[PDB]
């Protein structure tokens, strides 16, 4: 096309004004966006003592898929099925009158931090799921030591949001199974086998290993320049 021509621009220094490049690296973020990024940085800069970052070894994606597959079968009552089952328990008063036992034993997961800590202490829990992301971590940071001492298998899992999903909350921070249905006993057992393989059996070694000290990209890539030049 003889009408159309090729300009090409000289985007060098001191010539031909710069184009609209991406400066997402260079945004002055709002003050909260800096502090929520630099807090995560400052955690992994310092030497994290092993009582923290005995977290961040998390039940991985394939075996946390199995864990939530089992725990979703034992989901607690909603308000929808509770208001229904009280009406059938109303009919227990109306005509049932066993004593008050129109309803069977409910098999549900056990949640709530005070409840679950008390369930571990009486050694009634069969498996505990611990959220890694809770804040303040002081709420949960004693839980692996307690679970190790009472002999309850525990998993540090990702998501207090996800633990809240199976208990119909928004956040749960713990989720325990204290008894399963008899058809799911082998399902729990192979989970218990791998979860102690990842968490409880390493616990005596994880207790010694500090965390953090991870340097940033520039200062890491300047550290190996000093190593190669010396």
């Amino acid at each position: 096309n003889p009408l159309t021509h090729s300009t090409p621009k000289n985007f060098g220094i001191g010539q031909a004004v710069q184009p609209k490049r991406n400066l997402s690296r260079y945004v002055k973020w709002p003050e909260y966006v800096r502090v929520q990024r630099q807090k995560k940085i400052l955690s992994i800069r310092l030497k994290v003592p092993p009582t923290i970052a005995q977290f961040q070894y998390t039940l991985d994606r394939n075996t946390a898929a199995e864990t939530f597959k089992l725990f979703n079968k034992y989901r607690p009552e909603t308000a929808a099925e509770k208001k229904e089952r009280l009406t059938k328990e109303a009919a227990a008063v109306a005509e049932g009158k066993s004593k008050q036992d129109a309803s069977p034993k409910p098999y549900a997961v056990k949640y709530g931090l005070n409840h679950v800590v008390a369930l571990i202490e009486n050694k009634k829990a069969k498996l505990v799921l611990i959220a890694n992301d809770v804040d303040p971590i002081e709420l949960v940071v004693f839980l692996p030591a307690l679970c190790k001492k009472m002999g309850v298998p525990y998993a540090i899992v990702k998501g207090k949001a996800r633990l809240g999903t199976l208990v119909n909350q928004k956040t749960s921070a713990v989720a325990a199974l204290t008894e399963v249905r008899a058809e799911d006993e082998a399902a729990l057992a192979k989970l218990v086998s791998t979860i102690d393989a990842n968490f409880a059996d390493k616990y005596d070694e994880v207790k010694k290993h500090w965390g953090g000290g991870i340097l940033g990209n520039k200062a890491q890539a300047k550290m190996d320049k000093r190593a190669k030049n010396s």
């Binding site: 609209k20 991406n22 400066l23 997402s24 260079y26 945004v27 002055k28 973020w29 709002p30 966006v33």
Partner: protein, 121 residues
């Protein structure tokens, strides 16, 4: 993980939805009436001999008006009270703190007839 291309280093506040008010009760429940109607604008004629010299000679109706009335509210009130048309309004605040309006009518009307039609001279 992709991310949005940000051509500006400046982060501005986003444009959130600003809902309108939808109140559960009225603020005052009875609107005030017209705080300056025609009877509040025009109070009385000014009936000095100097104001009477302007009735025939100049075709000006001299009034005493509210201090809160501007030259639009004087013109509007004079028109629909006295069924005239105003050519011009000149207004002064008198040294007794009252507002005096020189209201000149258009040539179709005669301020001498209208002065008798109001009732003064």
């Amino acid at each position: 993980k992709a991310l949005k291309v940000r051509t500006s280093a400046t982060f501005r506040l986003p444009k959130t939805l600003k809902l309108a008010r939808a109140p559960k009760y009225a603020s005052k429940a009875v609107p005030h009436y017209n705080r300056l109607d025609s009877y509040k604008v025009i109070e009385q004629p000014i009936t000095s001999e100097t104001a009477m010299k302007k009735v025939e000679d100049g075709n000006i109706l001299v009034f005493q008006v509210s201090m809160k009335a501007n030259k639009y509210q004087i013109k509007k009130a004079v028109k629909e009270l006295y069924e005239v048309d105003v050519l011009k309004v000149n207004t002064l605040v008198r040294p007794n703190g009252t507002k005096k309006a020189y209201v000149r009518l258009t040539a179709d009307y005669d301020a001498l007839d209208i002065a008798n039609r109001i009732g003064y001279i």
